[PDB]
């Protein structure tokens, strides 16, 4: 059993880890104590990056994120989201909430759907198993692109496994 906090710093990009530490501390969470979510924040940030034609909302400091979002909402005619999205697609002209889950994707998809009370915001969930689920079966990215995200997730998993971190990481996902 290795250290998740060690794993994370020598696994993800220094930029992803840096943005995830802010995201955590911004909510009185300490990345050194809650290492499992620390790793979940990095993996999700990383997927938002591989995914993005796109405007990255996630990772930005709250004030900047809402500034970017609002400016978007009135250059276009899109309704203001309530919760900040992760991305904005001006191709399909909609926001995107992205999720990486260790649980059943359909369950996670609904929790997100019920939270954002969406009308137009798109939802796309990825898991560590390869199963995915996107709004109206509209998967946005072509196959190869989505295949890369799934690869990076598997890679993250097994590197977590060799260090004995997977077992704890995989079953500590809360709603
Ligand atoms: Mg977000």
From Swiss-Prot:
Phosphorylated on serines and threonines by host kinases, including human casein kinase II. Mn(2+) 1 binds at residues 44, 86, 97-98. Signal peptide: none annotated. Mn(2+) 2 binds at residues 58, 86. Disulfide bonds: none annotated. A motif (Nuclear localization signal 1 (NLS1)) lies at residues 102-117. It is found in: Host cytoplasm; Host nucleus. Plays an essential role in viral RNA transcription and replication by forming the heterotrimeric polymerase complex together with PB1 and PB2 subunits. The complex transcribes viral mRNAs by using a unique mechanism called cap-snatching. It consists in the hijacking and cleavage of host capped pre-mRNAs. These short capped RNAs are then used as primers for viral mRNAs. The PB2 subunit is responsible for the binding of the 5' cap of cellular pre-mRNAs which are subsequently cleaved after 10-13 nucleotides by the PA subunit that carries the endonuclease activity. Belongs to the influenza viruses PA family. Influenza RNA polymerase is composed of three subunits: PB1, PB2 and PA. Interacts (via C-terminus) with PB1 (via N-terminus). This is Polymerase acidic protein. The gene is PA. The chain holds residues 1 to 197 of 716 of the full protein.
